[PDB]
Design a protein around this ligand. Structure first.
Ligand SMILES: *[C@H](C)[C@H]1/C(=C/c2[nH]c(/C=C3N=C(/C=C4\NC(=O)C(CC)=C4C)C(C)=C\3CCC(=O)O)c(CCC(=O)O)c2C)NC(=O)[C@@H]1C
Ligand SMILES: *[C@H](C)[C@H]1/C(=C/c2[nH]c(/C=C3N=C(/C=C4\NC(=O)C(CC)=C4C)C(C)=C\3CCC(=O)O)c(CCC(=O)O)c2C)NC(=O)[C@@H]1C
Ligand SMILES: *[C@H](C)[C@H]1/C(=C/c2[nH]c(/C=C3N=C(/C=C4\NC(=O)C(CC)=C4C)C(C)=C\3CCC(=O)O)c(CCC(=O)O)c2C)NC(=O)[C@@H]1C
Ligand SMILES: *[C@H](C)[C@H]1/C(=C/c2[nH]c(/C=C3N=C(/C=C4\NC(=O)C(CC)=C4C)C(C)=C\3CCC(=O)O)c(CCC(=O)O)c2C)NC(=O)[C@@H]1C
Ligand SMILES: *[C@H](C)[C@H]1/C(=C/c2[nH]c(/C=C3N=C(/C=C4\NC(=O)C(CC)=C4C)C(C)=C\3CCC(=O)O)c(CCC(=O)O)c2C)NC(=O)[C@@H]1C
Ligand SMILES: *[C@H](C)[C@H]1/C(=C/c2[nH]c(/C=C3N=C(/C=C4\NC(=O)C(CC)=C4C)C(C)=C\3CCC(=O)O)c(CCC(=O)O)c2C)NC(=O)[C@@H]1C
Ligand SMILES: *[C@H](C)[C@H]1/C(=C/c2[nH]c(/C=C3N=C(/C=C4\NC(=O)C(CC)=C4C)C(C)=C\3CCC(=O)O)c(CCC(=O)O)c2C)NC(=O)[C@@H]1C
Ligand SMILES: CCC1=C(C)/C(=C/C2=NC(=C\c3[nH]c(/C=C4\NC(=O)[C@H](C)[C@H]4CC)c(C)c3CCC(=O)O)/C(CCC(=O)O)=C2C)NC1=O
Lengths: 160, 68, 160, 96, 161, 161, 161, 160, 160, 161, 160
């Protein structure tokens, strides 16, 4: 989280938190009251947004469910949908957390090294998270959309 | 003048180094007293744990003979 | 500043600006108006603040203005008041920047060596900064007084 | 690109290069070399093994390097000595 | 490196003055232009890769740089581009977030001409590629935020050439 | 290391559970009190050396520790003990800010016990110094952060003992 | 490390004895199987990526290891497990080509089991993966060198267990 | 001492004692008896030197013995003269050793941090050591006084 | 040997076996027949080669058989001939191994300290090795003789 | 390291009183033993190689250890043993000049047994070589330094065994 | 020299000279006239020392002047005597300097490789230096003879 990111820098430089660092640590909490319902709203759709994004993604890329495709079969499709659910859970975790910490530390550092022995399309995950961000914002208002858009941008900005 | 004889393991969890990542992940080595603190802080910063530390070289009294 | 501390931090990893960093930069630009107003209010009352702080300092530590004192004499006292004005200027710079980065480079790094060479009481200078903090917080509303005094306490802690 | 279309064309090129040669060792050589292209092409993900990121500090920028760029280099001879097994010890030891 | 906030403080500290009306007006202008910059930074991010591909197709590819002899002739020379680029983005996205040339002169555009002269690397080609990226980002970002992004891209191209 | 927030995230990611009412209750309970944590951390940072001074004066010095035959005897050992004093204070502040002793376990208590055993450090004296730290810090910060500051000093004392 | 020739040479040097008839038979026994070792090593090295890809499908994936709470869970741990598998395959190739587990004991096995104990990695899972790689290698290499390839994977599994 | 310094210098180079190194040891062992006489003289005159040094220090720097001074009262002044006694003992140890290794390992390394923590004037302590040197110079022969003054000046420079 | 050096260098390169190193492996396995043939061809005449090399060494260097030399005495001459037999064992080891790895580890590293402590002429031992070169070459075919002569000349360089 | 003067300094420093008449007597005795100490050290440094030569000829060479199947076999191992012998001689001279065996313990005697057991180096033969150097120095140096030379020579043997 | 050693160590540790280093400098400057007289005696007796040194070396090792000897021939022996004069001059340099930096930089660093290049017996050269030590100490009083003997033994130990 933000506290972890600040304390890591402080301990790396061997010093207390800074006079501009506490101003950010306090501003990270005052919007937490609003943000709690923002990440909450995506929480009770978690088995629905991914379910719809399957219908947004494997018709866009039909080779994912074609004989030369990686997601042929009901169980193979289930794996891709479970991966989408994992990414949705992680992005919600980071939304509740602050900085990129929850997603980067768990399911972002080593995507290419995983898929290197997995044969799963990174350019397909690009559109997958594009559609996830596309469908997860209309549940929110524009005020919440402004507090949700950058949190969605990091996946398609990192895997690239 | 004295060297601590210690053993420890340090895992790298940000880069996944991909060549002979075994000798640099578990080691025993004599480290000087003046450099022991900076050596041991690195293991804690990276995330590994120190398994044991030993005086080895010097006596507990200190006073004269400490310098080097 | 906050912008420098945020952009260069997301440049040491070879990534774009973090979705966690497309925030507190935001609160900084939001509170920039209040920061500018507070800095202007401190700047208008620079002479009164310096004069009253020097008065309080010379009462509380009268040994400095004695014959065996570093600041004994009319022009050695003028130099002490000039140093107090310098630190008030640095505090205003820190307030506008939103971080103690500029004040740190301008008037803190090596201050121990400079004052030891000149044979000046660093605790006396710190007490002078505290008196300046009291006089400054006497001229401001509670929130703005706390905001200015937080930087003042940074100066007091650093000169130590 | 039709990747499957190109891989079959590569297979045809490999086999047809095989037909020219009499398989002493030279027809095997061409097949092995052209097989390298298809094998190091297919997977989609072992290809492009990330960019080697050089992390920097707050004073200088952090850098990145394409993997293929350093894969065509002199391959970085290194020296590493293995001897923590034991100061006082138990393992195979010996002098190595 | 420097932003507007730090630049005003630095050139008001060298002469030892408090922040006057002009300095407050400059800081006021930056603070008022502090939201479109943040929005355009996020717009440049995510759509970065398509921006690079469009710029490459518009300027670099379909020219001397791709036929035998070019400096982008084979793969890994095509790969040193997209790289090379992603800088000139990344940077100047930093510039149009902490708006000042500064970063572009200290980190990216400094000795780059020497490096390119020692490594081949057609400077006219790599500046035409910069202007293509400028056009594509001006298209993607918006009407008003297309400017100052055009400013930093023009600064990069002019400094390089 | 972890704080209250990332501790909740990891504790739910281990079984793959989305954030529920109980988890959001824990996060709310952490968020409602951290502002007092920020004020207490600022006070401790501003008064770091003074706290070490009073803690040493009350618990260590004016004793046989500073005399010949003591562990704190000689300026080198005195500076070492005061640096350890400062390190304990800073890590206690980090733990109180984070709302979790994970950083204390990972970067303070790991190896400190048998390290002090191999060095001859009086663990009882270090514990007394830590409690003097906690007393001075509780006096300074006030009722708002007194127990939150003191719990991690007690954690350090219990880990050492 | 040592090969068959180096091991016999050292075993005769320690006695200070000239190469005898038995040493000649041992060297000839190594020499008659040299070519098939090169062929099997080339077969492994050519398609090692596909070998590891197939071996990952039989022993570890689609299980609780890849789920939350599993050792191989998360991107970093998954990539580390596959890197370890590639380490095992490459060093098994080296041991097979040298005709001696000495390199495996020197540069793979030493410290490995206590390292996995400290990290919490499943030694049984690693043993199963090593054996599955062993069947894949034995199937690919053919009757000519299947047993010779498999003996070093067996040595690795027995050393780990 | 000289012996440990020469031995460490030889051991670092992994070679036997150079002729100049042996000549140094021979000169030191030949001159040891004069150092022993210096040590016994300073030992039997330890209390008078400390008292006169305290008088000179309190005359030179009244601020240390003052309402706000570091040594105000009886136990503070007792501790100051006690520290002077420790430094006299260290000077005798250095004189007998022929070098400054024991003095360095006992009373100078970390003394800056210790005196900063205690808020004792380091220049005041240096003035006390200088007064101690002036007192000690009035109880020795000229060559012997110079020999002691070398180590006294070493302590003065080290506390700088 | 060859395999040891190839694997060590490839591992230091951090890659699989290169086709180059595979080439040296595939040709060493083939040439091991000729290497072994040279092995027992030298081993059958081990004693005669040593004796003739010693004889022509004695005639070429009367200085080693001198009052200051180490060869006065039948016991000393036997000790020298035993060293020669040791080195013919070493050269046949290197011939069978294909690399000079065993020879270096057995009888060249530290041989300078060997013969400096024992007061033995290293150039004389080199001349004996050259004499032994001639004697061994006299009983071998030209290509085979040159193959053994590579290791003999390497030894001649090694004691230098 | 701690020589005689430093040892007396530490002995009085841990108890915290001034130098006494007993300390004066001890320092005077060590000052009296200075010149013969320097002369003996100079002679040993002059005839360092000769001492190793006679010690080897008396206890090391022409035996089973100087034949195949020995730890002394091979020039590298023999050079390592003679370098260790020179180490013993040099550190014995250092301790002889210092007056205290602290150098002998920390720099030489510390360890030197677990390493020897791990390597397989015989220890009785090494002790015999140390005693061989003992009689060699006994003849090389005068009888004034013979006893103090012998006691430091026996110290290494006692520590090793 | 001693001055160079002390100044070099003080500069390397970035500090002023220690009192022990100053004491060693004082002893070195005190012994200056004695060192100069010893060097004057040696340089006056330079030729006789060389001649009887050559006679002792040739008596001990007649093999060097034997047919297989490095110095076989009148001009080869002249070169041996010239190297002898070189080392005597280096010994005088070291004696006046008070330490072994000039001797080291002039005649030992690389001497092993140079005499290996020339195929000359290093133990024979050391024995010649020992003969010089005997002849030189035969012309000097006991203390000065020991002082010269330290440098001669240093040369012998270095050539090892
Ligand atoms: C994979 C089948 C299993 C698995 C493995 C796993 N390993 C690590 C971490 C390390 N692995 C190594 C390995 C080696 N070092 C060497 O020198 C060699 C031979 C040359 C090997 C094989 C080491 C030392 C480490 C630690 C340092 C590092 O991370 O590089 C991890 C990561 C553990 C962590 O997160 O700290 C994992 C997951 N996991 C499974 O589930 C499989 C059974
Ligand atoms: C692309 C449109 C053009 C082109 C470029 C090209 N560049 C290289 C190699 C390098 N480029 C850089 C660049 C930078 N380093 C920095 O730090 C920055 C700013 C932060 C920049 C812009 C450097 C240093 C190199 C050399 C080292 C490296 O490759 O990382 C190449 C490769 C040249 C080669 O093959 O040796 C190429 C091809 N090529 C084109 O055709 C365009 C004109
Ligand atoms: C002070 C209250 C007590 C005391 C302490 C003392 N400590 C040392 C030496 C060390 N202390 C540490 C400490 C740490 N390492 C860590 O990682 C952390 C947390 C991040 C700590 C606190 C270490 C590593 C050392 C050894 C290296 C060094 O000295 O820096 C000494 C010195 C012992 C000696 O002289 O050899 C002392 C005296 N002494 C007291 O009297 C107090 C009770
Ligand atoms: C989905 C849009 C795309 C796709 C995906 C796909 N994934 C798999 C299999 C796995 N995916 C994972 C993922 C993770 N492990 C982790 O630790 C994390 C971080 C939280 C993730 C995201 C794993 C472990 C597997 C392997 C199976 C397992 O659960 O252990 C498949 C199946 C591949 C197969 O060979 O069966 C697929 C198809 N495929 C597409 O086409 C989409 C673009
Ligand atoms: C006297 C001339 C000056 C002065 C001194 C002063 N000292 C203290 C307190 C302490 N001084 C020491 C000193 C040492 N410990 C060591 O190991 C050594 C090396 C041999 C020394 C010199 C210590 C340990 C203390 C702490 C108390 C204790 O000994 O237990 C004080 C008291 C400070 C306080 O806050 O109480 C003072 C005043 N003051 C002057 O004005 C002179 C310049
Ligand atoms: C003969 C051509 C030259 C010569 C030799 C000479 N050697 C010795 C004594 C020994 N030589 C060795 C040699 C080795 N030990 C090893 O491990 C190896 C590597 C295989 C070698 C070559 C040893 C150990 C000894 C010592 C006795 C022993 O083996 O136990 C002597 C005798 C010296 C003495 O003082 O008695 C001699 C004379 N002499 C010449 O003139 C030739 C140049
Ligand atoms: C000699 C009398 C006997 C003997 C010895 C022998 N030693 C080694 C190897 C080593 N010896 C050391 C010793 C030290 N390292 C230090 O730092 C110190 C104190 C400063 C000592 C005494 C060590 C660490 C080694 C290993 C590294 C090296 O070889 O230099 C060997 C070689 C063993 C091998 O081949 O690996 C030998 C033979 N052998 C005898 O037979 C003698 C009785
Ligand atoms: C010797 C190794 C090597 C190759 C092969 C290579 C290929 C290569 N093909 C390219 C483009 C291109 N290549 C193709 C098409 C195809 N590509 C194929 O291999 C098929 C035969 C065909 C599809 C059936 C197209 C259409 C483009 C333009 C870019 C685009 O697709 O948008 C480019 C980018 C520059 C350009 O536009 O010319 C590269 C790097 N460069 C190399 O260094």
């Amino acid at each position: 989280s933000v506290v972890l990111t600040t304390i890591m820098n402080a301990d790396q430089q061997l010093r207390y938190p800074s006079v501009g660092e506490l101003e950010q640590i306090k501003n990270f909490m005052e919007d937490s009251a609003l943000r709690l319902k923002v990440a909450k709203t995506l929480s009770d759709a978690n088995d629905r947004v991914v379910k719809q994004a399957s219908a947004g993604l494997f018709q866009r890329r039909p080779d994912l469910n074609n004989p030369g495709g990686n997601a042929y079969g009901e169980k193979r499709l289930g794996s891709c949908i479970r991966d989408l659910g994992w990414y949705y859970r992680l992005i919600t975790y980071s939304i509740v957390a602050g900085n990129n910490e929850p997603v980067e530390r768990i399911g972002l550092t080593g995507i290419f090294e995983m898929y290197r022995v997995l044969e799963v399309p990174i350019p397909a995950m690009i559109e997958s998270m594009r559609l996830l961000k596309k469908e997860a914002l209309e549940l929110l208002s524009p005020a919440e959309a402004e507090i949700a858009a950058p949190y969605f941008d990091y996946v398609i900005g990192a895997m690239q | 003048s004295r060297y601590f004889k210690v053993t420890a393991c340090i895992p790298s969890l940000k880069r996944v180094r991909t060549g002979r990542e075994l000798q640099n992940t578990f080691f025993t080595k004599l480290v000087p007293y003046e450099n022991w603190f900076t050596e041991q802080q690195r293991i804690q910063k990276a995330g590994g744990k120190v398994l044991s530390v030993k005086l080895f070289t010097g006596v507990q009294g200190a006073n004269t003979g400490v310098g080097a | 500043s906050v912008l420098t501390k945020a952009i260069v931090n997301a440049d040491a990893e070879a990534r774009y600006l973090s979705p966690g960093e497309l925030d507190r930069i935001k609160s900084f630009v939001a509170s920039g108006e209040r920061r500018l107003r507070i800095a202007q209010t401190l700047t208008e009352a620079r002479e009164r603040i310096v004069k009253q702080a020097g008065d309080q300092l010379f009462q509380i530590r009268p040994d400095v203005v004695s014959p065996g004192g570093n600041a004994y004499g009319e022009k050695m006292t003028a130099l002490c008041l000039r140093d107090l004005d310098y630190y008030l200027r640095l505090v205003t710079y820190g307030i506008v920047a939103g971080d103690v980065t500029p004040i740190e480079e301008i008037g803190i790094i090596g201050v121990k060596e400079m004052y030891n060479s000149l044979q000046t009481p660093i605790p006396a200078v710190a007490e002078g900064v505290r008196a300046m903090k009291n006089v400054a917080t006497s001229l401001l509303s509670g929130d703005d007084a706390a905001e200015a005094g937080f930087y003042f306490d940074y100066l007091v802690g650093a000169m130590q | 690109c039709s990747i499957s279309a190109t891989i079959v064309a590569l297979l045809e090129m490999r086999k047809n290069a095989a037909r020219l040669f009499k398989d002493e060792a030279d027809s095997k050589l061409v097949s092995s070399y052209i097989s390298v292209v298809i094998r190091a092409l297919d997977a989609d993900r072992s290809d492009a093994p990330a960019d080697i990121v050089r992390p920097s500090s707050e004073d200088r920028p952090g850098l990145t390097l394409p993997y293929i760029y350093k894969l065509s280099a002199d391959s970085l001879t290194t020296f590493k000595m293995t001897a923590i097994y034991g100061a006082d010890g138990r393992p195979k030891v010996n002098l190595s | 490196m420097q932003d507007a906030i730090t630049a005003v403080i630095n050139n008001y500290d060298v002469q030892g003055k408090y922040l006057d009306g002009a300095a407050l007006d400059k800081l006021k202008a930056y603070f008022t232009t502090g939201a479109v910059r943040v929005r355009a930074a996020a717009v440049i991010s995510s759509n970065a890769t398509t921006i690079i591909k469009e710029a490459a197709a518009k300027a670099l590819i379909y020219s001397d740089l791709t036929r035998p002899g070019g400096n982008m002739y084979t793969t890994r020379r095509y790969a040193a581009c997209i790289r090379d680029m992603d800088y000139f983005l990344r940077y100047a996205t930093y510039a149009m977030l902490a708006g000042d040339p500064s970063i572009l002169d200290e980190r990216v555009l400094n000795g780059l001409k020497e490096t390119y002269n020692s490594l081949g690397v057609p400077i006219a080609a790599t500046v035409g590629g910069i202007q293509a990226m400028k056009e594509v980002v001006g298209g993607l970002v918006g009407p008003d935020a297309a400017k100052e992004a055009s400013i930093y891209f023009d600064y990069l191209s002019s400094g390089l050439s």
